[PDB]
Every structure is written in C-alpha cells, then in structure tokens.
DNA sequence: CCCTGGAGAATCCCGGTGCCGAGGCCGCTCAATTGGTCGTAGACAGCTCTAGCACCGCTTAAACGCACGTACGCGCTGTCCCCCGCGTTTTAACCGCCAAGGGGATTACTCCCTAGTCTCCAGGCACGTGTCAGATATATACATCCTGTGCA
DNA sequence: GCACAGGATGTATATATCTGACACGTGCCTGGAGACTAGGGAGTAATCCCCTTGGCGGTTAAAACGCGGGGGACAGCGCGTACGTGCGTTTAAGCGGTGCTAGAGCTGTCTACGACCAATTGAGCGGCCTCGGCACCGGGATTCTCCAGGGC
C-alpha cells in the first residue's frame, strides 16, 4: 500500500457528534477543516517559537502557548481560549 | 509488568491527538525543548476552535434545511461572525460563495 | 410585448449569483490561458487537475473581491456605472 | 596692616567694619592666588562686599577687564541698582531680554566692548554662551553658589567651560546634602588639587582644608533684636480613612507608582487621592477636618493663635495641599493670602505687600516651600507652621528664617506637624542628619 | 498557441461582476479586467513553478499552488 | 488693501515645506499623555522608556501620512479638492480596518 | 476640597498638527470634521499596538515598556519599523 | 605546524561574515542541519542587497551636495526605485519622510 | 565594562567604502543598515526553513537558499543576487 | 398618480435515483511506560543606570479665538449616447470513452557530508579621543504672486 | 476683457563660527578556524502504476451579434456656505533643576527538577470494502414581483 496519511479528521468528526449530535459533514469540509486546524496550529506554534527566542528561553511552555494565543485570538474568543486552555493544564497536572 | 496504557488526551479530558501534537512540535523546528503542558493547552485551544466554527456552521446548515456541513455553511457561519471573520480575514474557502449584500443605492426607488 | 426595465434583471442576477456557490469561468479556456501562461517560465510543463481547479477559486474570488471595492468606489463617486478609473483607484489603495 | 576702613571709591555712607574685613580678607585673597567660598549668609549683604572687590580691582589695579556676575533674574535688578547707589564708577551692563534685545545688546555694546562688568542670568548665560566664550574673563562671580552643587549638569558644564582667570561663589547654604556637592563646587573654585571626588582623622582634617577657600560668619555679630526661634515638634496620629489608605498603599483603579510619594500625602490628607471624597454634592462641611489629624490640630491651634498675637504663616510643599487648606480657610470665615508656584510675579508681590502692612486684616498667609525668591518680608508675622518637612533642613531653615527677617522684632515659634510611624519619620531622621552633618562641617 | 485570454469571455466577467454586486457596468471594464487577471495569475504561477523546480519536478501540484498562495498572503483551504 | 495671498498658495508652500522636512509633526508631551492614558485600561502600574513612545510617534505619524495620501486620491477620484470623513472611511474599508 | 480638570488627553492631538499631517500627505483642502475622525483612528490604532507591546511586556515578566515590544507589536502588525532594534 | 587561520570570507572573496552567518542559522531554528555552501550563499546575497542600497543612498546624498548618508538619503533611495520599493513595501524608515508629490489638479491654473 | 552587542556595521561600512570610497554614514543610518540586514535574513532563512520542511529534509542547502531568493527578491534583483551567490559557492568550492 | 390586471419568475409539495458518507474489519507503527541522566532555569546577591511623582523657575513658540472674503461643494437642468434587455444564429464546452506512456512515488544501497570535540589564535568589540561636516546665522540676489492700469 | 510693471514676498545662494558626533587607534578576549572521527541523511539506480495527455463524436448550453430605446453620465449654471489667511492673545510646551526609590539589565553561583534518550509494547489510527439515507433531479401547482394603462 502507499503512504499513510495523517490528519484531525476522526476528532473533528468526534466533535461534531458532541455538539450537535444529528449533523454529518462532507468530503470538501472535512478538508477545509483539516487545513484551518493545520493553519492555526502553525501560526500559534510560530508565534510561541518567536515569543522564545525573543525572551533567550529554549523551551516552548503553557506560558509561551497563552501568550501567543492571546496576540493572535481577537478578545472574546482569546478569554475563552485561555479559561480552556488552562482548565484542561489543570486536570492533566491534577490527574497525573 | 506495566499499567494499562492511558492516553494524556484522557488524562486532559480532551479529544485531539495530545501525542500527536507533542510530535508535531518536536518536529517542527520551533523551539529545541517542548514541556509537558504546551501539548495540552494546544489541544484544547485547537479543540475550542473547532468546536465554536462547527457550532455555528452547524446551525446554518440547519437554517437551509440540511444535515450535511458543507463549505456554503462554512463560510457563512465565518462571514457572520466578527472574531471568525477577523481571524480568517486573508483566507479563501473554495466554493464558499459570498455574502448576499447589495449597496442600498442600487436598489430601485 | 413583455419587457422589463433595465436594471431589474441585473438585480435578479445580482441575487442568483450572490446565492450560487459554484465558478463562473470556463474550465477549458481557463486551462488553456493558465498553460499559456506558464509557457514563459518553463517547457513541457505538466498540471494536476486539482492545481488548475485551485487557481480558478484563486481567481475568481480575488476578481470578485476587486469588483466589490470598485462598486464602492464608483458608489462614493455618486455613479452607478463603475469604470476603470474605479478598478485603477481600488488597485492603488489595496497597494498593487 | 591690609583694607582696614572703608574704601575712598565706594558711596552712600562708610562700609561696617564687620564688612570690611571680609572686604579685606577677599583683597587678601586675590594676592594669595587661591579662589574661596564667601558663606557669611544674610548679613548686611554680599552684594556690596563683591561690588567692593571689583571696585578695587578696576581702581587700585588696571585691570578693567571683561568682568562677569551670574545673579538669578530675580535679583538682577537689585544688583544692578547696588552697582548704580553704591560703587557708581564701574559701568555694568545688564544683558536680558527676547532674541532681538540680545543681538542688538552684544552688537551694540558687548562686541564694541567698551563695558567692564556684566550682569546677566542663568538663562542667558545658556542662551549666549557662544558669544561670552570669546571674551577673556578676568573675574567670575556666581551669586547663590548652590545652584552648581551638582556636576554633570548644562550651567555646571559650561560655566567652566569659559576661559576665566579668576573665580568666585557666593552661597549663604554651602551644604546641603551631603560632601559630593561641596567637592563639586570646590573643583569648580580650583580643579588642579579637588581632582578625587573622594576627630582627629575626620573633623579637623576637613575644617583647616576648607578654611584655606571659604569663609562663614553668623548673624550674631549685632544682634540686638531678633528673638530666637521655638521649634515644637507635634505628633498628630492618622484618621480613620488616613489609616485605612496607608494600610491599603503598603499592601498594594488608582495608580500608586512612588510608593513614598504616595504615602506621603496621604498622611497629609486622603482627599488627594480619588474615591475618598464624600458623595457627589461635594458638601465642604467637617469633611476636611476630621478625616486629617494635622487638620483638627491645625483647627486647634487657629483659634488659639487668633486670640493670641496671631498673623500666622504656613509653608507646605504640595499645592494640593493649599488648595484644601484654603477651602478649609474659606469656610471657616479666615481671610488668608496664597504665594505659589503658579502666581504671577505682580500678584506675588501685590499679595506681599498688603500682607505686610502694619494695620492688615489678612490673618493666614500660605507659601510653597521653595516656592519663595529667596526675598519676601514677612516680618510682620508671629507662627510659623511647617505643615510638612522637607529633605531639605537648609530649604527648612530658610522658609524659617523667612519671618526671621530684620523687620521682625518679635519671638517666632516653629510647628512641625509629624505623623508618628510614618514616612514622616523618616523624613525627619534624614533631615536631622543632614542638618548635623551641616552644622559639624560648617558651624563649628 | 495563443490569444487564449480572449477566451475570459466578457458574460464571465458580467457573472463575476454581479456576484461581487454591481449593476452597471461600464465598456471598457473587459480589457481592464483581463489584465488584472494576467498579472495575478503570472505572480501565481511563477510562484508555483519555482516551487516545482525546486520539487526537481515535470508537474505543479496542488499542493505548489496552495504554497505560492499562502507566501503571497492568499491562504486558500480546500485542498490540502 | 494690505497684500494677501491667494485662498490655496500658502497651503501649496506648507505642503512643499513639510515633504522636504523629516521631523516630528506632533507635540511629544501630548503624545506621551495620549500613550499613558491608553495603557492604563490595557494594564496599570506601567512604565514607559522613552525610546517606546518615540517609536509609536514615529509609527502613528506614518500610518496618519499614508491615510492622507490615500484620502486625497479618493477625494479627487470623487471630483473634488476637499476631504472629508466619506473619504478617510472609505479608504479604511478598502484597505480592510 | 478642589478639583479642577483641564482637558481630553486625545484634544492634545491639536488641529494644528492634523493639518500638518495633511499637508505632508498632500491635501490642499479639509473639511472642519476631518479631526474628530482623525482622533479616533489615532486612537484605535494606537490601542492595538500598545495592546500587543503590553501583552510582550506581562510576557517578560516586566513592568517596562519596551522599544523592542513596540517593535514587535509593529511587526505583528505589518508595519515593520527599521532603527530602533 | 598549524596552517595560517584563513578566513572563509576572504576565501569566498565576500565582505560579510560567514562564520557569523553560519552560527546564527545553526542557532535560529530553521533546520537541524545547515550546508556548508548555505551561509556562504546567503552572506553574498545580502552583501549585494546592502551595496545596491549604499550605491543608490549615495547617490542621493550627491544629489542633496552632502558627504554623509542619513535616513532622509536611505528612504529616498528606497523609494524611486520599484524594486526596493516592492521588497520594503510595508516597511517604516525612522526620521525618513516622503518623496515630494502633489497630484496635477492640486496644482495652480 | 558593558555587554557585547553583534552588529553588521563593520561589514556594512567595508561595503560602503568600498562601492562610494569618500562618504560616510551616521548612526541612525547604520541602525537602519542593521536591522535591514537582519529583516532579510529572517526572511530568507525562514523560506528556507520552510522549504525544507515541504520538501521533507533536514538539511539547509544553497539551493534551498537560491529558491527562497528567487521567491523573495522580485525579478531583476533576484537574478542578480542568485548570480552573485552563484560566483561566490563557486570561489568557495573551486579552491578552498 | 395611485389602483387593477396580466405575464413571468420564484417557491412549495411529491416521487424516483444514485452515490457518497457512516460503519465495521485488519494490520501496523507510534505513543505510552519505565528507567537514567544532565543541563536549564528558578532563585539569590551585588552593582549601575533609568523612570516616576510632586514641585520650581524661565522662555518663547505654538495654539487659540476672530473677523472677512472667495473659491467651491452641491443641487437642478438639459442633452445624448451608450449600455441593457431580447431574439437569432453559431460555436465550442462538456461529457463520455478510449489508448498510450511519462513520470511520481517507493525501495535498496552506499557514500560523503555534516555534527561534535579539542585546541589555538586573531578578528571584533568597548573605550578614548581629536577634528571636520553640518547646523545656524546673516546678508544679498533672484524667482513668484498679485494687483492695478492701460489699451483695443 | 486681456496683457504688462512693479512691489512685496518668499526662497535660494555664499560665507563665517562652532560643536558634537564620527572615524580611528588600542588592548584583549571570546568566538571562529584547523584537524580529526562517527554516523546517518541524501544521492543514485531500478521498478511500478497511476495519472496525465491526446484524440473523437454528439448535445446543447453558452457566446456572439444585431436592434431598438430609455436611463444614466456629464457639462453647465447659480448660490449660500465653509474654509483659508492674517492678526492679536493666551497658554502650555520645552528646557533645566530637586529628591528619593524601585525596576531592569548584567554578572556570577547553585541547585534541583523537568525534559531528553532508549527499549518494549500494545493499543490507536489509517486504509479498505460495503450498504442504506440524504441530496439531487424532474414535475406540477401555487404565490409573489413588476410593468403598463387608466380613472382615479
Ligand atoms: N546703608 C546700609 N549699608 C550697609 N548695610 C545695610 C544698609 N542698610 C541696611 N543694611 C543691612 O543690609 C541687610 C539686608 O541686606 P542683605 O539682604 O544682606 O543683602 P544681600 O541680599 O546682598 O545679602 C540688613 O540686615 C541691614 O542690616
């Protein structure tokens, strides 16, 4: 067989069943999908790589993660980020 | 002998790939160190992200009495929302179409 | 007989247009000025499908983009008509 | 055996004899080739002992050449006038004034150059410094020394950037702060031997290096008025708001940025911040007396001082600060006077005037601390009240000796209203070594 | 070949004018027009070829388009 | 009687003046005031060095220089020889603020 | 008990000093509401950018404004700006 | 015996600093691995890059009868030329100004 | 004694002397001079970097450098600069 | 000068089709577990320079308020011309089908190029220091603008 | 109603002083070059098969073209308003100071805790195959609009 390839769609498509239980998605969706998960985690993983080198640290941590999530996001959607964000650090440093 | 393996996803409560993000970024050349928690709040940013977009992706599908998500849908539920609008400004959705807007100058009087 | 007003079916197809989701321009000919293009860098050239399809939703949707800038433009100079001079303002302020 | 009675050129009347030593002794110092601090403070006056030293210079010596005064705008009239009454051959120029007045003043008088002292100001020493650099200057006199204190400042620079045979400061307060400022003035009397910034090792060794180059007398000499002065020193305790915004600042919208600045007006009064003040209606009403311990001692104190011999001064180094006192002032039925930073100089000495007639009904007058022109006789008054302290105990005891005038013939007593564990505190332990610091280095 | 950018034939750019919302439109738009796609297009495709040069390739790919756009900051999601 | 030039001249020689000249067009105590005043509400408690606010003069005056630039040739683009908010608010949405 | 304000911060931004703004872009001719505008696009973008420099500064663990975080606030913005850092 | 300590710019006949160069790529986080021919490429680019702006900076610099370059001289050479022009499109110059430019209705008839 | 900051100015002011020999430049100007430099090379080091990762290497080369100058650069610059590169590989490789 | 009355376009309820998304299986590779180490960052301590807060002083340039005249923005009108709506003929897109082969993607192999380490040494940087390039000021010399006046 | 003179204004040009930054010299130290070794990434050859290109024929929608007409673009005219210009006044900017104290950068140490690397391993995820529900296409009946003509 040929090469496998990899991609978010079995969690997006999980996601989807959480919020709304009775909706399917297509082909075509499930690719832009694909690609604006891959374009948000490049730019937010650029901007934590930047934020590093501008402050001589050699390493990525929640605090680079939330800073660049808070230069990138606009307002709202940066607050409820951040409170996700930090709710789920705080139940896996809980739960290990 | 060793536990049952339990996924940081589970452990995080969460539903995208943890370990796969955690390669991602070592990978990446972003950095030469990645710690333990920049994984987790990733996954959950890019979760919460997604989460909102097809919420609101999913009601517009509803509104044109459909149950497939499809780019029409998407990029009306983009277009007519502020944060997602400015956060995809620069981005083309193919076969998305436009907003139906019409410069009240044209319209007959 | 039956005739209508000049400008009624331009709003129709206005919102025919504004509803449909699908391309406007012909595949063939697209294809054709797209090779035609690319005759100037290289030679025996080879395209996917896919990289044609990307190009015209590239195309399409920055010319509509311009049309809708032009339509303001001509709007602010208390016309309906829009014109070249609207396209070449538009370009300028975008910064081409 | 040198310049022992008053000198044939000078005028209007014969020269102190406690003046003409210092007269003589400066003779004495020119001769001996070092440059030296005259420190006798306010006596009869510095003004004439410098006029007589140029006068000897220009008569006895020829040597009439470019001379230079660097007196604060302030004073320059009155220098001006002393050069007219007393010493009337030597011929200042008074350069001041807008950009046309000083190039048609250089080109008209300084560059013909047919002058032999020039008077001029700070400001315009700045301003024309590219054309008083040319002149060779053979005397240069700097009238209230302690403006050059510091080194690495634009006047410091420049002043000794000139080409200057021979130099000399005049300053009532040598010290200040602490023996940094005094090198720097030392260094500008002589760099070649106070190039180094830096009771038997100490003490003596500083009192016979400065007696070399300075010189200082006390105004004891006649005396025969002038009361001393009593210093009471009140411990008041904070209010209520006081201490609930003083525990609030230590443990932290307001912006609170100087952490000692902010404590410290708020031991004055929590009405200079925001969200402390009463309701809207802004009802001046017993609101500004109980909410400060200084204002109900202060509204103590009034009524008893009216009764009493009365016409009060107040010095206080925050205009918020009078401006509630005046509000205070006014609604308690007390006419009073404000000399501030922001009064024009008519206003200033409009203000002074009335105050100092003899048959005045103005009871209250309130000062900003250093806001005074070093001038300003208010000898007609009796309390002085320090509302605050400064860093300062020379700044203190000038503000202090500003109703210690000649005019005043009656005892003076001094208020110091002090928080008790407080910044207050601190404020006065500094200012108390300061002041000894001044007093074993200079006084004794 | 050529005289392939007549074939933007001016009912495409009257369909392409309406859905951006225009009524009117003037003559002389049409040539106007096609340049404006000639040169968008030449910077696009450049893009894309110099990607598959490098690639050491006879084919764009997709994937070489969806590069070109995005250095020119014309993200498209779609295709991969 | 006394001379008076023309109503447009003496703004043609301001406009020649100021795009021969490089300096600051804009009163840095006010500017800095400006700054501060923004900042409080993002954070309190802030200090500024003052090659910071050196830099945003710098910015805003060339993002204010470029508006007008653009303002202008929407207002001749409009016939005319004034501009006005129409035309500033339409040079933003063309330029996507 | 005295209190007195004296102006808008954003009034300091005088007329004056729009109209020579203007006049560098090259206009001739301004409308009287051109500086109420002018004001409040100063004001937004001036809100953006300090938004993005203080969010570097928290980042730094610093209570200083930095010319390197407004630069990088610029950057982010794409308005590069060359000779301070 | 150790050979003399030679330069590899002197050895590409470049005036930058490769050594530099190579450092700061190993160090930047770009790959994990750099060529030896990468950073002797990259210094002859921009060595070329910084000559052509001194050339055209100077030559304003003659235009303007001075004997220094100050960002006035920069930003008028980075403008008037298209190339410099689209490459520093978006780029501010510190104390630079504006090139003169009054539009042709402006103008007195 | 204070830090130690790295700068092109050196290198900047052998170039300046040697392509205009009596002239001179000031510190605003080398300023500008330097973070110029640096911009292009972000720039170009970050093409490479991401032309590398498309093409699934590890390895920076000068031929990833010459594509990311001839994607950056427009047109006769590009040219001349890969030209330059170009001369300057082969002095390198040919005797050294 | 708004109120019928027809055409034409769009919308809504039904029925047959197909094809694509959802589901269920198989195999593999990649993440989770456990063990060991190191090196980075958090913490501390000492020094040196910058910034904030409350003032003071002086100087003077710039903002402000005002009055007046004059271009100019804006509305109204007339003309024409060109773009639009519609019908007819022509042309090629499009769909389906087929055939052939270039080249993209994969695998195995081996080399050669780069990372890593050690050692030595000279280029680059901080610090002083003097001098000249340019900023400023003044004083002519010329280019521009505006207005009045004279004339055909 | 047009074209020139001159007067006032502003702007350029030449030259003299002076000062504050730039260009150069010096000491030294730290990062770069010379030499070597080890290992895996990338170049090279060979294979497969898939995806590209070429070609053909038939339908039919879409494009090209022409005609007739009404609505919009544009030039012109007049006016009442709002802005540019110059002037006298006020105000706050600008510069130069005080007095203290914390913040931040740099240097220099220390230590421990978190991140990297390795072997093992089983569970997760990707590819594949199949089938029913959703979407689509086609059709008939119905509402809603827009335009013309007239008695409102
Ligand atoms: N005619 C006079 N000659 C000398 N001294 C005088 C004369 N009249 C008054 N004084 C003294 O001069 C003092 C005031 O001058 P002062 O303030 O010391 O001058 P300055 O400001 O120059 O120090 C008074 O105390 C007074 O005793």
Known sequence: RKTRKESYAIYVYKVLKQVHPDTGISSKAMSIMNSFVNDVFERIAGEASRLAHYNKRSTITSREIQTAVRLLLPGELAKHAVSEGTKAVTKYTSAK | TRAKAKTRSSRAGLQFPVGRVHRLLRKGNYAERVGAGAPVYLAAVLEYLTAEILELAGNAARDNKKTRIIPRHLQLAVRNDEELNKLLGRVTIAQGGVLPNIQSVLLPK | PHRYRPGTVALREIRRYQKSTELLIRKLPFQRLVREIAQDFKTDLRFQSSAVMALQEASEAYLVGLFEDTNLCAIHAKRVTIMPKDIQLARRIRGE | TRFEDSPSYVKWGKLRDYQVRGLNWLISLYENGINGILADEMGLGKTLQTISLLGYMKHYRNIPGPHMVLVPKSTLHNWMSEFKRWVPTLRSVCLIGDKEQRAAFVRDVLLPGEWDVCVTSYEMLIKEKSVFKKFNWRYLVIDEAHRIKNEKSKLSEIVREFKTTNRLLLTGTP??????????????????????????????????????????????????????????????????????????????????????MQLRKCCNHPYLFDGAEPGPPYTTDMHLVTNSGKMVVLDKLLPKLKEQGSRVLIFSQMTRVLDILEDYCMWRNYEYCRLDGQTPHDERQDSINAYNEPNSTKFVFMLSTRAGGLGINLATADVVILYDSDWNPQVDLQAMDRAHRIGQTKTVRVFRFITDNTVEERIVERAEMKLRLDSIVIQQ | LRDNIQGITKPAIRRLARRGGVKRISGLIYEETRGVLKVFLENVIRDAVTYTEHAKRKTVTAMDVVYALKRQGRTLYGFG
Chains 1, 9 share one sequence.
């Open chain 4, 175 to 260: 010290l200040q702060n602490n023996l940094h400022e005094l090198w720097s003035l030392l260094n500008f009397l002589l760099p070649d031997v106070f190039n180094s910034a830096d009771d038997q090792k100490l003490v003596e060794r500083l009192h016979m290096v400065l007696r070399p180059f300075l010189l200082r007398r006390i105004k004891a000499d006649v005396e025969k008025s002038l009361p001393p002065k009593k210093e009471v020193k009140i411990y008041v305790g904070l209010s209520k708001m006081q201490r609930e915004w003083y525990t609030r600042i230590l443990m932290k919208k307001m912006r609170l940025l100087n952490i000692l």
